CSV table of C-alpha atoms and ligand atoms in Angstrom, one decimal:
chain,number,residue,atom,x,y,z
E,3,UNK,CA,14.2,-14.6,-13.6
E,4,UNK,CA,13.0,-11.7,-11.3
E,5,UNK,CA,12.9,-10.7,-7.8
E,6,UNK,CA,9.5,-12.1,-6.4
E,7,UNK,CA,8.9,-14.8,-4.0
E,8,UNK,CA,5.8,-16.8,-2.4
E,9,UNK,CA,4.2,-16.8,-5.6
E,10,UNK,CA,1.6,-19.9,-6.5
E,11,UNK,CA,1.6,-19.8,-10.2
E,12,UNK,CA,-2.0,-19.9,-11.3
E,13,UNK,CA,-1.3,-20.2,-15.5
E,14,UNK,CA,2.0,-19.4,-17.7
E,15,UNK,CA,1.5,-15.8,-16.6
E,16,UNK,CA,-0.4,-15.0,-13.5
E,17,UNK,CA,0.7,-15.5,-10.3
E,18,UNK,CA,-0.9,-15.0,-7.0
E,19,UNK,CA,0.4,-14.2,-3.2
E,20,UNK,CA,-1.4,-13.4,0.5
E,21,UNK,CA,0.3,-10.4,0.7
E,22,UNK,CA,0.2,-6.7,1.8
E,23,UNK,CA,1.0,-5.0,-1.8
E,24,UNK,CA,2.4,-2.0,0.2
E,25,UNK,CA,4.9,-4.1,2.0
E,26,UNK,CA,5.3,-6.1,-1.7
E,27,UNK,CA,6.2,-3.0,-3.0
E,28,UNK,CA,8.7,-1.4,-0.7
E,29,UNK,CA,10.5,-5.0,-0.7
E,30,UNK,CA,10.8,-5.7,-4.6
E,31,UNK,CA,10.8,-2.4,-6.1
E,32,UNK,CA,9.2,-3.5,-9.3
E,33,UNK,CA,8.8,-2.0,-12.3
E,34,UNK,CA,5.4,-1.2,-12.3
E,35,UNK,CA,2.8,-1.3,-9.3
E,36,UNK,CA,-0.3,-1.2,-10.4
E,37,UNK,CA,-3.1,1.1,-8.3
E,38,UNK,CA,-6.6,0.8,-7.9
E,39,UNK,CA,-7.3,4.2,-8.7
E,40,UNK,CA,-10.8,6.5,-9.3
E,41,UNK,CA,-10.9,8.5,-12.2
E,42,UNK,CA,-10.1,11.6,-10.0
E,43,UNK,CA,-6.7,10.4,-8.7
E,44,UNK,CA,-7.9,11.0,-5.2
E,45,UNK,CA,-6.3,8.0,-2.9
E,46,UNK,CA,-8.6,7.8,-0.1
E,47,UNK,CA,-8.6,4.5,0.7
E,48,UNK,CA,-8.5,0.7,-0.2
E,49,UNK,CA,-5.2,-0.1,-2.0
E,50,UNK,CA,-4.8,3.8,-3.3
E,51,UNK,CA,-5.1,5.2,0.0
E,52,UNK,CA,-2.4,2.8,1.4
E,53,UNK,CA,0.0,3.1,-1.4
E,54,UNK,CA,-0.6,6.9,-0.7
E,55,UNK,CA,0.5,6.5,2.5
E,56,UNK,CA,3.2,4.8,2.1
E,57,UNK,CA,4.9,7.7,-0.2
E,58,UNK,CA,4.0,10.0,2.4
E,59,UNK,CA,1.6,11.9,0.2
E,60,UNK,CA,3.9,12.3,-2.5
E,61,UNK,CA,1.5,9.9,-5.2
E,62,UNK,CA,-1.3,12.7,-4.3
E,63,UNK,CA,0.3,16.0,-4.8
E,64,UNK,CA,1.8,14.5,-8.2
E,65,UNK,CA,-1.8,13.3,-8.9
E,66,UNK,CA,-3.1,16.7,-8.2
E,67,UNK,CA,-0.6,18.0,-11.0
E,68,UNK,CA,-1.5,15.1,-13.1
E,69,UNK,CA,-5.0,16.2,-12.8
E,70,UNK,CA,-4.7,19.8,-13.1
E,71,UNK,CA,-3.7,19.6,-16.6
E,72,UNK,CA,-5.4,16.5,-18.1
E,73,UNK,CA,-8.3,16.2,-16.6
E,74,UNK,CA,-9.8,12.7,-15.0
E,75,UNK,CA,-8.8,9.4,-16.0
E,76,UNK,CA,-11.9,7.3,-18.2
E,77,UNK,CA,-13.0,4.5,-16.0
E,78,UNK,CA,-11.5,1.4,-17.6
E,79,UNK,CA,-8.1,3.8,-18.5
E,80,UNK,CA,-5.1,4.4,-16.8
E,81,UNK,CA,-2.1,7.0,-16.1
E,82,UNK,CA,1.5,5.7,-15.6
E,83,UNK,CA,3.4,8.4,-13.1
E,84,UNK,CA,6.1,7.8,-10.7
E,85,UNK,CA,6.5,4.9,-8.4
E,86,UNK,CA,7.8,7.1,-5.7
E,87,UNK,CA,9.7,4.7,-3.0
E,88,UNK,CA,7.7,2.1,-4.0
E,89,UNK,CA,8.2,1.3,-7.5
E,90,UNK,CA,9.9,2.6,-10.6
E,91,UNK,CA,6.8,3.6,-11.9
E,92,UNK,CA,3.3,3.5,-10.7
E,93,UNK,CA,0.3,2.4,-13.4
E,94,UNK,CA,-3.3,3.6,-12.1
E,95,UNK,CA,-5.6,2.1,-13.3
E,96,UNK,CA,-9.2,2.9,-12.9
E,97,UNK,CA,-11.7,-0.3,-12.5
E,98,UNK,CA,-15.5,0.2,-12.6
E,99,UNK,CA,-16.7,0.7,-9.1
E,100,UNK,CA,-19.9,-1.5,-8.1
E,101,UNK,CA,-21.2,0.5,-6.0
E,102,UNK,CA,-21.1,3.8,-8.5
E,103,UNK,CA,-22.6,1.7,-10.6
E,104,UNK,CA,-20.3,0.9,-12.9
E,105,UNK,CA,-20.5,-1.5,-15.8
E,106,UNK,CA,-19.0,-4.2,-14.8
E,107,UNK,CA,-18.1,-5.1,-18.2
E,108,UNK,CA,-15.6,-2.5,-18.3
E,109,UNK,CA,-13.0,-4.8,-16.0
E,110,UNK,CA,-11.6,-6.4,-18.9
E,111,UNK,CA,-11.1,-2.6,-20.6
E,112,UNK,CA,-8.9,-1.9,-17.0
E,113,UNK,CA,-7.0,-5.0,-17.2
E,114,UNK,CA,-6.4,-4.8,-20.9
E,115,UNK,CA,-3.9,-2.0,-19.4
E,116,UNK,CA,-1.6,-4.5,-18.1
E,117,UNK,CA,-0.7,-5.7,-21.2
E,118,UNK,CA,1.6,-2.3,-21.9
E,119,UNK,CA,4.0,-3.8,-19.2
E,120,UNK,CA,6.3,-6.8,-19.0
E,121,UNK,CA,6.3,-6.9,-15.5
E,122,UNK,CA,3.9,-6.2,-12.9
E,123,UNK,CA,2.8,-6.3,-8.9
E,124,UNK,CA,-0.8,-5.7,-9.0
E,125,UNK,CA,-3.8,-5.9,-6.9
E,126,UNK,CA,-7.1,-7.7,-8.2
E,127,UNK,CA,-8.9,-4.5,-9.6
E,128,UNK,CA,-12.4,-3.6,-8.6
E,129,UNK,CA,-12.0,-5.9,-5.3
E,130,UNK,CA,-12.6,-4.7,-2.1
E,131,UNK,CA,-13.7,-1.1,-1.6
E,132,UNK,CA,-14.5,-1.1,-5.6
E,133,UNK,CA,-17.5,-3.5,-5.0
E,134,UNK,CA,-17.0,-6.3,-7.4
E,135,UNK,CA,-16.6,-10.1,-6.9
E,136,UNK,CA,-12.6,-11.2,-6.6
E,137,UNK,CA,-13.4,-14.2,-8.0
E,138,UNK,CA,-14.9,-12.6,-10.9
E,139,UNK,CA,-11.8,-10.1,-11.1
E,140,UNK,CA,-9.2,-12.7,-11.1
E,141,UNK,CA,-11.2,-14.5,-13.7
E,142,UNK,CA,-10.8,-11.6,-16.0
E,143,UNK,CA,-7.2,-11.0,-15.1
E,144,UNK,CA,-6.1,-14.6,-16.6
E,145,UNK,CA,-8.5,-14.2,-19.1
E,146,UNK,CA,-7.4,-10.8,-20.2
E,147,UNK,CA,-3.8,-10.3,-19.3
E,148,UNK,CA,-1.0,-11.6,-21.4
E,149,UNK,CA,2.3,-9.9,-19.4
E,150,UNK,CA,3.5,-11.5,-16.5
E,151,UNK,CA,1.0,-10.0,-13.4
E,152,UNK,CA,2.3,-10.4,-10.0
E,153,UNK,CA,-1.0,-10.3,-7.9
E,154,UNK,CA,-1.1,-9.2,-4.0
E,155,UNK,CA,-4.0,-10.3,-2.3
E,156,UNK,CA,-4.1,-8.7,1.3
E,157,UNK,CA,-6.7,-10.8,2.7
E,158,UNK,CA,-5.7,-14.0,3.6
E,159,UNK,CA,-9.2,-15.6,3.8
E,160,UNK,CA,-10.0,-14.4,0.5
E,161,UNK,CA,-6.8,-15.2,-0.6
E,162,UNK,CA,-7.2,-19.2,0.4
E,163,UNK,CA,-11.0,-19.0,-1.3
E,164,UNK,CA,-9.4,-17.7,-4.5
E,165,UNK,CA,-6.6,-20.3,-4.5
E,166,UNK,CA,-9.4,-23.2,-3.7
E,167,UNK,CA,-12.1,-22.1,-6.4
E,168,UNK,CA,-9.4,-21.2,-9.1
E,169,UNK,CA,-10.0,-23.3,-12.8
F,201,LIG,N1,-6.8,-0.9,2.1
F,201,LIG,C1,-5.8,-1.5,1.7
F,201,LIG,C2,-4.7,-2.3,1.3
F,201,LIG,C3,-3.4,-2.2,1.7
F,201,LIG,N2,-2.6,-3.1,1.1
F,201,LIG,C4,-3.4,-3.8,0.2
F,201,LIG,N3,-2.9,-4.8,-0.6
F,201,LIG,C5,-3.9,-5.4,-1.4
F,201,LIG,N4,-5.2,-5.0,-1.4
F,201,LIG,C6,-5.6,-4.0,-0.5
F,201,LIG,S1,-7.4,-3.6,-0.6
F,201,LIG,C7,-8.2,-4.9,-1.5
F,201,LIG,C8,-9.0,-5.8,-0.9
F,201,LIG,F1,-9.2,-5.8,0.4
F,201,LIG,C9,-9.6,-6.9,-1.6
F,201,LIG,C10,-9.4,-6.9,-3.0
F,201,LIG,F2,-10.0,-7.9,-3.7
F,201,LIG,C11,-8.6,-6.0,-3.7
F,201,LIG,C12,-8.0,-5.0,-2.9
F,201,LIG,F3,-7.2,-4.1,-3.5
F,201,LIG,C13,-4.7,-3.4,0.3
């Protein structure tokens, strides 16, 4: 038993909610939130530049750090760092971006990441901002994620279309 609540259950491990993940977040503290990160840590909008926000800048200077010393992320490959007051932990994780021209094939690599964590709150990855089809993405997710995924779908529009056309 855990702490989140709304959910539709899509299959034995994904689960879907209309829901701002920011607000999500600050509510459940989960384990992991997951963030639709660039390779370059820099949160400038979309999901990252909300979830940015919401720590008052602190995800970014810690990205910066992160950064410094590592280098950028691989698209397809995450980080975990700190959840800040949002989460124990945060998981970026980098989705190809459509219109960088990305492959696309590389959204199962991202979501593969999930599977390093029991537990997660997570946004489709490569919606919005990131180009891709959210039908697509939550294809992949159920088709690539084994750990239970919490996912937050701000939109409530797309939400209901996602819900409707799921298999
Ligand atoms: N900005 C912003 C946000 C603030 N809270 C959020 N909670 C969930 N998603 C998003 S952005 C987004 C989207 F619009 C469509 C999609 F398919 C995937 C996404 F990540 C935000």
């Amino acid at each position: 038993v855990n702490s989140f609540s709304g959910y539709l259950k899509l299959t034995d491990n994904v689960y879907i909610k209309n829901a701002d993940i920011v607000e999500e977040a600050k509510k459940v503290k989960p384990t992991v939130v997951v963030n639709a990160a660039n390779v370059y840590l820099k949160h400038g909008g979309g999901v990252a530049g909300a979830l940015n926000k919401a720590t008052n800048n602190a995800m970014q200077v810690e990205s910066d750090d992160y950064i410094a010393t590592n280098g950028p992320l691989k698209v397809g490959g995450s980080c975990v760092l700190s959840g800040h007051n949002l989460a124990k932990h945060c998981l970026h994780v980098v989705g190809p971006n459509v219109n960088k021209g990305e492959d696309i094939q590389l959204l199962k690599s991202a979501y593969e990441n999930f599977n390093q964590h029991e537990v997660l709150l997570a946004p489709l990855l490569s919606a919005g901002i990131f180009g891709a089809d959210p039908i697509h993405s939550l294809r992949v997710c159920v088709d690539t994620v084994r750990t239970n995924v919490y996912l937050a779908v701000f939109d409530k529009n797309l939400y209901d279309k996602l819900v409707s056309s799921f298999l």
